[PDB]
Amino acid sequence: PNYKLLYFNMRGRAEIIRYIFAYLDIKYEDHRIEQADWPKIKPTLPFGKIPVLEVEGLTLHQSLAIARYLTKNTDLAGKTELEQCQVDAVVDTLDDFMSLFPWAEENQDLKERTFNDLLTRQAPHLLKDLDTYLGDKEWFIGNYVTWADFYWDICSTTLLVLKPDLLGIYPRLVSLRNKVQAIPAISAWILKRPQTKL
Amino acid sequence: PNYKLLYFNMRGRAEIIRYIFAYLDIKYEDHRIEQADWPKIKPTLPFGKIPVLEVEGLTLHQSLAIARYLTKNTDLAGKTELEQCQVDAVVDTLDDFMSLFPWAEENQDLKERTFNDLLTRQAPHLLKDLDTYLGDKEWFIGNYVTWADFYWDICSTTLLVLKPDLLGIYPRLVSLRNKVQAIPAISAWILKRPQTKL
Ligand SMILES: N[C@@H](CCC(=O)N[C@@H](CS)C(=O)NCC(=O)O)C(=O)O
Ligand SMILES: N[C@@H](CCC(=O)N[C@@H](CS)C(=O)NCC(=O)O)C(=O)O
Ligand SMILES: [Mg+2]
Ligand SMILES: [Mg+2]
């Protein structure tokens, strides 16, 4: 159909949707909002947040709800209902952590304090658990890629911008990034996407 | 098959799973752990958090992933893939907001100030968006109940503990929670469940 993605000019919370469109070879409009235009756009959206995805005029919201929609009936979702649950759960574990960062906090001293606590004290526990769950499997679920693996590439890319040595203990998690990035459609998207900090 | 739900003796993040089991008439073990026994249990769980659900020898985690698993192929999920997206999205919008509350904060002055700000300043924006989305529909999605409606009853029950007058000006949201509570399986569970603050 006709797809229009609306987000800021960032990877951020839209990037999972962008990976899925690339992987499934689905054409879409990648509409990027400049910051100064956001007050104009915000009241037009159902819950006042981005990303949203318009599908033939119907506006969907919530990045992970949308990602899950786009992967319905594909192997990327998980091949069984139990595996779909495992995929969903890894995604929400990652998203829970990323959602703790006070990205819009105005007080920079409090913002940095929270970022530091998250990156220094809390992140090692997440990483240990992700690495234990992955084990020596090829991908999070087993022997095939799912959108949870995509979400790890995306989240880790941003965490690495914030803390460049983040993955220094976990080469299996690095190998997982490398495997996702080597998928030809993903590799091509990474080469062509706008270079933004976040 | 030997469904065993592990959580604290609270509604909290297990309650959505408990509503779904009630509605679908699925027998399960509702295992509640006292705070004192949590330190020994925590390291045995792949991601160190509760709730978890034991299902066919697997330990599933993430309350909403588990809820989605239990509702797969039922009308509670949403009947079409677009409706499933809308259900998923309302649930994540609610969960995003409830996750802002610093439930585990030990500085009680800070906790109270944050709670009060959320309830006073932020909640009207969320509640307006939810009320507007519901409109005059019978249920969030339209003409049938979904687990998004359940999640509204669950979230709102705790919000009303925190601020009894909160829904005074949202009669449609009051009506929705009353409609959910009047579903016989939900009524039965509400009458049976342990009385806890949260
Ligand atoms: N869990 C939601 C979060 C949506 C969200 O909060 N998006 C931010 C931008 S990353 C936003 O729109 N913030 C409100 C604002 O800036 O007015 C999702 O993944 O879609
Ligand atoms: N988004 C997760 C959150 C899970 C979570 O954070 N659970 C808390 C209890 S409500 C926990 O286990 N905290 C860690 C601890 O208490 O050690 C879910 O809905 O399952
Ligand atoms: Mg979430
Ligand atoms: Mg009505």
Tokens of A57: 């005029």
A132 chain-B contacts, CB cut-off 8 A: 46
Q: Which is nearest to B24 in space by CA: B169, B179, B145, B113?
A: B145
Identify which of A44, A56, A5 has the alpha carbon closest to the alpha carbon of residue B132.
A44
Strands (E) in chain B, as ranges, are 4-8, 29-33, 52-55, 58-61
Give me Rg for the CA atoms of chain B. 17
B169 CA to middle of ligand 4, Å?
16
- Experimental resolution (Å): 1.1
Q: Would you list the DSSP string of B132-157? A: HHHTT-SBTTBSS--HHHHHHHHHHH
Residues 6+ apart with CB under 8 A from B134: B140, B172, B173, B176
Do A11 and A153 touch, CB atoms closer than 8 A? no
The amino acid that residue A160 corresponds to is: L
Which chain B residue has its CA at the smallest distance from A50's CA? Answer: B93
- Going from the Cα of B95 to the center of ligand 3, the distance in angstroms, rounded, reads 6
Contacts of A68 in chain B (CB under 8 A): 84-85, 88
Contact B104, A122 (CB under 8 A): no
CA A102/CA A122 separation, integer angstroms: 15
> How many angstroms separate the CA of residue B195 from the nearest CA in chain A?
28
Same fold yes or no, B1-74+183-198 and B75-182: no
Is A89 within 8 Å of B56 when comparing Cβ atoms?
A: no
- Ligand 1, atom 9, residue with closest C-alpha: A50
B192 is in an annotated binding site: no
Six-digit token string for A89: 């759960």
Q: What is the CATH number of domain B1-74+183-198?
A: 3.40.30.10
B139 is catalytic: no
Q: String of b and e for A38-62 (b: at least 16 CB within 10 Å)?
A: eeeeeeeebbeebbbbbbeeeebbb
Minimum CA–CA partner of B48 in chain A = A129
Angle formed by the axes of helices B63-70 and A81-98, to 10°? Answer: 150
- Checking B12-15 for CB contacts under 8 A at 24+ apart, the result is B12/B198, B13/B50, B13/B51, B13/B63, B14/B50, B14/B51, B14/B63, B15/B154
Coil, helix or strand at residue B64: helix
State how far Cα B31 lies from the chain centre.
Answer: 17
Q: Which amino acid is at B65?
A: A
Q: How many CB atoms lie within 10 A of CB B96?
A: 15
Is ligand 2 within 6 A of the CB of residue B9? no
Q: Could you say which of 1.10.40.60, 3.30.70.260, 1.20.1050.10, 3.50.50.60 is the CATH number of the domain covering A75-182?
A: 1.20.1050.10
- Ordered by start, the domain boundaries in chain A are 1-74+183-198, 75-182
Tokens of residue B74, six digits: 């039922």
H helices of A37-146, in order, are 38-41, 63-70, 81-98, 108-116, 123-134
Check whether the bond before B51 is cis (ω within 30° of 0): yes
Does B152 qualify as catalytic in the annotation?
no
Strands (E), B36-126: 52-55, 58-61
In angstroms and rounded to an integer, the radius of gyration of the C-alpha atoms of chain A is 17
Tokens of residue A149, six digits? 């693996």
Whole-number Å distance between alpha carbons of B53 and B30: 10
CA of residue B155 to ligand 4 center, whole Å: 20
Residues B16, B64 contacting (CB under 8 angstroms): yes
